[PDB]
Amino acid sequence: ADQRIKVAKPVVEMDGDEMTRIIWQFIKEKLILPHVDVQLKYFDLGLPNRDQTNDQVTIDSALATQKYSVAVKCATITPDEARVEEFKLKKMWKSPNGTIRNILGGTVFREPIICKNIPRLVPGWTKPITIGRHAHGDQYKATDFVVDRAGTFKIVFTPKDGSSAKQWEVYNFPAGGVGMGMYNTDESISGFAHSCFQYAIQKKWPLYMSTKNTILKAYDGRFKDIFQEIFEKHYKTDFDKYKIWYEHRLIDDMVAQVLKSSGGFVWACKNYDGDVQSDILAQGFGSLGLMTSVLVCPDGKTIEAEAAHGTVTRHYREHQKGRPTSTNPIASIFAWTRGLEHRGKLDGNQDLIRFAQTLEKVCVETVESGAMTKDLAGCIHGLSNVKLNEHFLNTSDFLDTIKSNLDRALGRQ
Amino acid sequence: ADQRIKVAKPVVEMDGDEMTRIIWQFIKEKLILPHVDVQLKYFDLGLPNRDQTNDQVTIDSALATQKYSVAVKCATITPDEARVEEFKLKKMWKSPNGTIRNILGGTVFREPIICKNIPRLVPGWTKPITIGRHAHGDQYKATDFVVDRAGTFKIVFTPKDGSSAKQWEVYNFPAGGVGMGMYNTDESISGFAHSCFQYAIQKKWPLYMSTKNTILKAYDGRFKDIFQEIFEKHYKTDFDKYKIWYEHRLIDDMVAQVLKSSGGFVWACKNYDGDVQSDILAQGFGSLGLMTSVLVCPDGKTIEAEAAHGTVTRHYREHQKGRPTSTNPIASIFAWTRGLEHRGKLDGNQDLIRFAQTLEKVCVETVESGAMTKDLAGCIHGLSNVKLNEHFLNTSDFLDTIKSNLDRALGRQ
Ligand SMILES: [Mn+2]
Ligand SMILES: [Mn+2]
């Protein structure tokens, strides 16, 4: 090789679990470190270390991200009963993503990584679609509980200024059941709106925001009102100028509209809807492994790029048996590239920016050239008609191919 | 002569709004009344009458349904700010569907009405999919509010038996925002589970139930636990016997799995998810107008069949100008057939059951023969390449074709 790109500021690195943790290291050693001299503020968010630090490492990584402005995160495990037993956890630690997002705040933008040779499950989507998932509140910062006997469920709001408090009787349970309370803030919703309007303008695409305000008149109505107010005051002039538009839509009408569309728009989703619908989008364009996920804070300075899929336990078990696997690392690679690209933009480091964009292009070109992992090969020839080294490559070999293609792309620059 | 089929018990009829209200009457006059002598317990749920009765007519229709066991419902308008002004409403009346479902309870089963010549937007779904939407609680019976200043949001649960009350601080608002509380009951969830397991066995199909219990551990965990408990105690023996299975899945994993599947399964959805995902299914199979929606109550005797799509305001405006339209009446027709079929099953009226099933088959055969409304014609030739009487027919003419085909079919019997 030659000189490695010098990076003036550090990048926060959040290590993850199982198979994703394994390929994360492969990516670091084969594609990043050899070409980039970056200081990494390492935080092991692997389940074992979270348990050892009583989940404090998760909070620490979020604070570090605020300080340094950029973080790249590896997929992690959100503990359930079985995981508690498997890892002998002292507590069923809450979702680290939820914790990080709550601290940083913002919008998680998700878009498909388009490869011309990968078949879409929804033929009609000829253009990409971007989802802006509000990353704060609602079901992810809720208080839920089980009721085991008849009783009254009420809510009390007590003003800090000392003004008259208010109460609501949510329900008088005749017997057992469940209850929950959730919230969101005008401040968080506003930041969410601004980020989405700005993204739509950058893309020169229309923007749609979905809710079910016909049912949750106050809660969802707030989202609708704030979006419209912010639109009229700050973005309508530009939207009209660029011949795009902004429209609120009821969630059920919206999902049908999207499925029947040809894509080419930004879709602002509440936290829960963003979670559910982004997986429909990823799968619809071809694969869950072909999607980027970047948390953009309202400050327009801080971001957290992540691999938003599972930890591929199946493959991990094989890896533990000393066997190679064919795990798609593309999503993890884009977490690194989006992070390095932002680091470069903040520092005005053109070489780093060019490196990140080059690696992303090389990933797509590599797949389009026919080199890919088993999952993608299956999407083309059928999950039951693909043979190793014939239709797909194992993770390590796939990465070596990317590395080769990368050097070539950089050499011709 | 009067050869109408005699019906011994009444059927509750819930009239609706705008264009659906118009075609509802066409259906009654052209397809139902000429062939069936049924006593209809009429309730006008049109927005104007709901306003006139302070929405009491909605409750009255639900009580009638409990009494007579069968209701057929026309699509209605759920009032928003614009509707309040348009209809000069004294109040923004809540969703009548939510009101009826809360009173009756149960599961809303939704399935596509498959026509061989209508293209799917999701090619992979070679077999139908049925969604069992829990019809009670959650967001549809929630208490939501806007917070306009700093203050504490807390929840208090006070047991009736005098045992220790419980309190939770949901959030301390630093400024303005929104808050809400929602609930569900063990009883309602259990009825929902039973209906879905029974439906899967009737279909000889696997059953999947989705939640996000990794986040809402108590609330969603309750659904997961109750389903598993009921499965093991009442249905595992039959599922094993018929080689089918029951599995819980996280909602985001589930939607991706569904999109990539070939269909052929029952999907139990929480109220909200059922609402959103049923529109994706309807659109995915071809059209929002090609879907049945039947509320099956916990008592295993009461049902409410409805046309679950919009009121087609656009076409209604044209109708008001004395102009004919090409509005798809199939969903509304199936509301009547599913209702009459159940009436027949309860009364042991074979002729009525045969009539209902014959009419459903005739509708499908008619569309497959090439006779259809503009929306379906567009799905085949393209919304911008269809000509009246060439590729599609206006509503009245389409209904006349169905009537003609129906008589021919009933005659062969
Ligand atoms: Mn997700
Ligand atoms: Mn709906």
Q: Please name the residue that has the structure tokens 């006070």.
A: B158
Sheet architecture: strand order including A151-159: A166-173, A151-159, B151-159, B166-173
**Residue A247 distance to chain B (closest CA, Å):** 15
Angle in degrees, 0-180, between the axes of helices B18-27 and B330-347, rounded to the nearest 10: 50
Beta bridge partners of B129: B265
- Into how many domains does chain B fold? 1
Q: What is the 3-state secondary structure (H, E, C) of chain B?
A: CCCCEECCCCEEEEECCHHHHHHHHHHHHHHHCCCEECCEEEEECCHHHHHHCCCHHHHHHHHHHHHHCEEEECCCCCCCHHHHHHHCCCCCCCCHHHHHHHHHCCEEEEEECCCCCCCCCCCCCCCCEEEEEECCCHHHHCEEEEECCCEEEEEEEEECCCCCCEEEEEEEECCCEEEEEEEEEHHHHHHHHHHHHHHHHHHCCCEEEEECCCCCCCHHHHHHHHHHHHHHHHHHHHHHHCCCCEEEEEHHHHHHHHHHCCCCEEEEECHHHHHHHHHHHHHHHCCCCCEEEEEECCCCCCEEEECCCCCCHHHHHHHHCCCCCCCCCHHHHHHHHHHHHHHHHHHCCHHHHHHHHHHHHHHHHHHHCCCCCHHHHHHHHCCCCCCECCCECCHHHHHHHHHHHHHHHHHHC
Please answer yes or no on whether A176 and B154 come within 8 Å at the CB atom: no
Asked if A330 has any chain B CB less than 8 Å from its own CB, the reply is no
**Residue A159 to residue B35: CA distance in whole angstroms:** 64
Please answer yes or no on whether A170 and B149 come within 8 Å at the CB atom: no
**Residue B261 to residue B258: CA distance in whole angstroms:** 5
Q: Please name the residue that has the structure tokens 């009419």.
A: B359
Beta bridge partners of B166: B157
Q: Which amino acid is at B230?
A: I
**Residue A133 to residue B25: CA distance in whole angstroms:** 43
Other Cβ atoms less than 10 A from the Cβ of A370: the count is 12
Q: Which amino acid is at A16?
A: G
Beta bridge partners of B268: B132, B209
| CB < 8 Å to A190, chain B | none
> Tokens for B26?
């066409």
Q: Please name the residue that has the structure tokens 């004919």.
A: B324
**Residue A234 to residue A222: CA distance in whole angstroms:** 18
Ligand having the closest approach to the CA of B131: 2
Give the CA distances from residue B214 to residues A80, A97, B222, in Å, rounded to whole numbers and listed in that order: 6, 12, 12
Q: Which amino acid is at A107?
A: T
Cα pseudo-dihedral B61, B67, B71, B77, rounded to 10: 20
Asked if A10 has any chain B CB less than 8 Å from its own CB, the reply is no
- A271: Cα within 13 Å, side-chain hemisphere: 22
Q: Is A412 annotated in some ligand binding site?
A: no
Element (H, E) at A42: strand A40-44
**Residue A97 to residue A271: CA distance in whole angstroms:** 12
> Tokens for A53?
């630090």
Measured at the CA of A208, the angle between CA B317 and CA A276, to 5 degrees, comes to 115
**Residue B297 to residue B305: CA distance in whole angstroms:** 11
Specify whether the CB–CB gap between A278 and A232 falls below 8 A: no
User: What DSSP character marks residue A382?
Assistant: -
Nearest to A104 by CA among A274, A272, A273, A296: A296
Specify whether the CB–CB gap between B27 and B329 falls below 8 A: yes
Specify whether the CB–CB gap between A131 and A154 falls below 8 A: no
**Residue B118 to residue B287: CA distance in whole angstroms:** 8
> Tokens for B272?
């909200």
Q: Which amino acid is at A355?
A: F
Beta bridge partners of B14: B43, B73
**Residue B133 to residue B136: CA distance in whole angstroms:** 9
User: What DSSP character marks residue A350?
Assistant: H
**Residue A153 to residue A171: CA distance in whole angstroms:** 5
User: What DSSP character marks residue A248?
Assistant: E
**Residue A278 to residue A129: CA distance in whole angstroms:** 10
Q: What are the residues whose beta carbons fall under 8 Å from the beta carbon of B219, sequence distance 6 or more?
A: A142, A144, A145, A178, A179, A180, B184
Q: Is B100 annotated in some ligand binding site?
A: yes
**Residue B26 to residue B400: CA distance in whole angstroms:** 10
In terms of Cβ atoms closer than 10 Å to its own Cβ (0-12, 13-18, 19+), residue A117 is middle
User: What DSSP character marks residue A390?
Assistant: T
Please, what is the end-to-end C-alpha distance for chain B in angstroms? 19
Residue B39 dihedral angles phi and psi, to the nearest 5° = -85, 120
> Tokens for B121?
């937007």
Specify whether the CB–CB gap between A21 and A47 falls below 8 A: no
Q: What are the residues whose beta carbons fall under 8 Å from the beta carbon of A232, sequence distance 6 or more?
A: none
> Tokens for B250?
């996280």
Beta bridge partners of A180: A144, B182
Asked if B82 has any chain A CB less than 8 Å from its own CB, the reply is no
Specify whether the CB–CB gap between B146 and A222 falls below 8 A: yes
Domain that holds residue B310: 1-413
Asked if B91 has any chain A CB less than 8 Å from its own CB, the reply is no
Angle in degrees, 0-180, between the axes of helices B395-412 and B350-368, rounded to the nearest 10: 130
Identify which of A173, A185, A216 has the shortest CB distance to residue B142.
Answer: A216
In terms of Cβ atoms closer than 10 Å to its own Cβ (0-12, 13-18, 19+), residue B225 is middle
**Residue A268 to residue A200: CA distance in whole angstroms:** 10
**Residue A180 to residue A146: CA distance in whole angstroms:** 9
Q: What CATH number does the domain containing A398 carry?
A: 3.40.718.10
> Tokens for A69?
């402005």
Ligand having the closest approach to the CA of A273: 1
Asked if A123 has any chain B CB less than 8 Å from its own CB, the reply is yes
Buried/exposed code over A66-90 (b: 16+ C-beta within 10 A; e: otherwise)? bebbbbbbbbbbbbbeebeeebeee
Nearest to B250 by CA among A186, A95, A398, A43: A95
Buried/exposed code over A252-288 (b: 16+ C-beta within 10 A; e: otherwise)? bebbbbbbbbebebbbbbbbbbbbbbbbbbbbbbbbb
Q: What are the residues whose beta carbons fall under 8 Å from the beta carbon of A309, sequence distance 6 or more?
A: A20, A75, A288, A289, A291, A331
Nearest to A27 by CA among A295, A278, A340, A390: A340
Asked if A150 has any chain B CB less than 8 Å from its own CB, the reply is yes
Nearest to B77 by CA among B140, B17, B15, B24: B17
Best mutation target among B141, B155, B248 (most A Cβ atoms within 10 Å) is: B155
Please, what sign has the CA dihedral across residues A343, A347, A350, A352?
A: negative
**Residue B134 distance to chain A (closest CA, Å):** 15
Buried/exposed code over B268-289 (b: 16+ C-beta within 10 A; e: otherwise)? bbbbbbbbbbbbbbbbbbbbbb
Please, what is the end-to-end C-alpha distance for chain A in angstroms? 14
**Rg of the Cα atoms in chain A:** 23
User: What DSSP character marks residue A265?
Assistant: E
**Residue A62 to residue A101: CA distance in whole angstroms:** 8
**Residue A115 to residue A147: CA distance in whole angstroms:** 49
Q: Which amino acid is at B319?
A: H
Approach to solving: X-ray
**Residue B96 to residue A271: CA distance in whole angstroms:** 27
| Size of chain B in residues | 413
Specify whether the CB–CB gap between A54 and A360 falls below 8 A: no
| CB < 8 Å to A123, chain B | 121, 123
Q: Please name the residue that has the structure tokens 């006349």.
A: B400
> Tokens for B183?
């609930």
Other Cβ atoms less than 10 A from the Cβ of B251: the count is 25
Specify whether the CB–CB gap between B110 and B293 falls below 8 A: yes
Beta bridge partners of A72: A13, A305
- State the DSSP string of A134-200: E-SSGGGG-EEEEE-SSEEEEEEEEETT----EEEEEEEESS-EEEEEEEEEHHHHHHHHHHHHHHH
Beta bridge partners of B44: B15
Best mutation target among A157, A168, A270, A291 (most B Cβ atoms within 10 Å) is: A157
Q: Which amino acid is at B150?
A: A
Q: Is A260 annotated in some ligand binding site?
A: yes
**Residue B216 to residue B137: CA distance in whole angstroms:** 16
Other Cβ atoms less than 10 A from the Cβ of A58: the count is 24
Identify each DSSP E strand in A244-380 by its residue range: 246-250, 265-269, 291-296, 303-306
Give the CA distances from residue A191 to residues A224, A282, A298, in Å, rounded to whole numbers and listed in that order: 14, 25, 5
**Residue A367 to residue A289: CA distance in whole angstroms:** 13
> Tokens for A2?
């030659």
Nearest to A294 by CA among A257, A248, A245, A331: A331
Please answer yes or no on whether B139 and A222 come within 8 Å at the CB atom: no
**Residue A135 to residue A144: CA distance in whole angstroms:** 19
**Residue B197 to residue B18: CA distance in whole angstroms:** 37
User: What DSSP character marks residue A119?
Assistant: P
Other Cβ atoms less than 10 A from the Cβ of A153: the count is 26
**Residue A323 to residue A256: CA distance in whole angstroms:** 43
> Tokens for A120?
């879409």
Specify whether the CB–CB gap between B197 and B304 falls below 8 A: no
**Residue B266 to residue B206: CA distance in whole angstroms:** 6
**Residue B366 to residue B14: CA distance in whole angstroms:** 27
Beta bridge partners of A269: A133
In terms of Cβ atoms closer than 10 Å to its own Cβ (0-12, 13-18, 19+), residue A382 is exposed
**Residue A412 to residue A358: CA distance in whole angstroms:** 11
**Residue B319 to residue A141: CA distance in whole angstroms:** 48
Specify whether the CB–CB gap between A260 and A284 falls below 8 A: no
Nearest to A77 by CA among A103, A52, A95, A101: A95
Identify each DSSP E strand in A229-327 by its residue range: 246-250, 265-269, 291-296, 303-306
Residue A387 dihedral angles phi and psi, to the nearest 5° = -120, 140
Please, what sign has the CA dihedral across residues B277, B279, B280, B286?
A: positive
